[PDB]
């Protein structure tokens, strides 16, 4: 059969995006945005690559993402979305470049140092 390649990668969370041209299905491991994700399940945050270019369809998606809290494995979806819309055209990709949501924000937790208690939290220092 037909299936379209896609994967995401951000913040300890990897995705398996699998597009078919359809109407809009979003169930990660057969669990919907209102089944998996709780009440903060913003559609425009998720479907903003649809919501700012080729709005919207939608198109049916077999999706398999896992790892970490809800926002982290929500931010790791847009790479496979850009791959799938890229398999449509790179013509929309210049608009994606001008609208962003493509440059992966690498901001993870900064590494701690052995010698303190957090990455930057010092001692509650006295007078001396």
């Amino acid at each position: 059969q037909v299936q379209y390649s896609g994967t995401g990668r951000r913040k300890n969370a990897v995705a398996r995006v699998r597009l078919v041209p359809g109407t809009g299905k979003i169930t990660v491991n057969k669990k919907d945005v209102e089944e998996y994700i709780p009440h903060a399940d913003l559609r425009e945050v998720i479907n903003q690559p649809f919501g700012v270019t080729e709005t919207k369809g939608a198109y049916d998606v077999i999706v398999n993402v896992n790892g970490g809290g809800y926002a982290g494995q929500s931010g790791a979806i847009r790479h496979g979305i850009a791959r799938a819309l890229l398999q449509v055209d790179p013509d929309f990709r210049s608009a994606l470049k001008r609208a962003g949501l493509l440059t992966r924000d690498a901001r993870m937790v900064e590494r701690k140092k052995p010698g303190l208690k957090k990455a930057r939290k010092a001692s509650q220092f006295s007078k001396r």
């Binding site: 009440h39 903060a40 913003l42 559609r43 425009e44």
Partner: protein, 154 residues
């Protein structure tokens, strides 16, 4: 800090209500970065506005910014080296900053029992010349033009 003017570090728009001063107030009320409980009390506060004597939520915030608005700014700073305080104009980002700050100041400690009684009623109250945003507006209108002329060179 010392070297030059620091980069601005702006904000993000809402998906639903589609605003950023709203979003900056969302961040100003948010404690421990816990969004979802704060999100529910945000939508509940906008729904207490919208139904109870409410036309529109953009309109009630515009009616706030009519009556909220920080207009002046006293500044206790020396250059010559003494107890010098200058009233100066308020920066526009600092104007929104002080406005949302006054909102959280009086919606935080109004004194009503349930947690968003005081929140939702004060974001009703700031729209129509009530709340301590108006009290601090009186403070701004009063203590300015008074301690000016000694620190007039600022």
């Amino acid at each position: 800090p010392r070297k030059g003017p620091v980069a601005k570090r702006d904000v993000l728009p809402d998906p639903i209500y589609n605003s950023k001063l709203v979003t900056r107030l969302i961040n100003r009320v948010m404690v421990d970065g816990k969004r979802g409980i704060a999100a529910n009390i945000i939508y509940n506060s906008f729904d207490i506005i919208k139904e109870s004597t409410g036309n529109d939520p953009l309109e009630v915030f515009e009616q706030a910014m009519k009556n909220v608005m920080p207009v002046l700014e006293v500044k206790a700073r020396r250059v010559g080296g003494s107890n010098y305080q200058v009233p100066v104009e308020v920066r526009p980002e600092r104007r929104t900053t002080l406005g949302l700050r006054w909102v959280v100041n009086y919606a935080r400690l109004r004194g009503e029992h349930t947690m968003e009684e005081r929140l939702a009623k004060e974001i009703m109250d700031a729209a129509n010349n009530t709340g301590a945003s108006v009290k601090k507006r009186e403070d701004t209108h009063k203590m300015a033009d008074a301690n000016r002329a000694f620190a007039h060179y600022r």
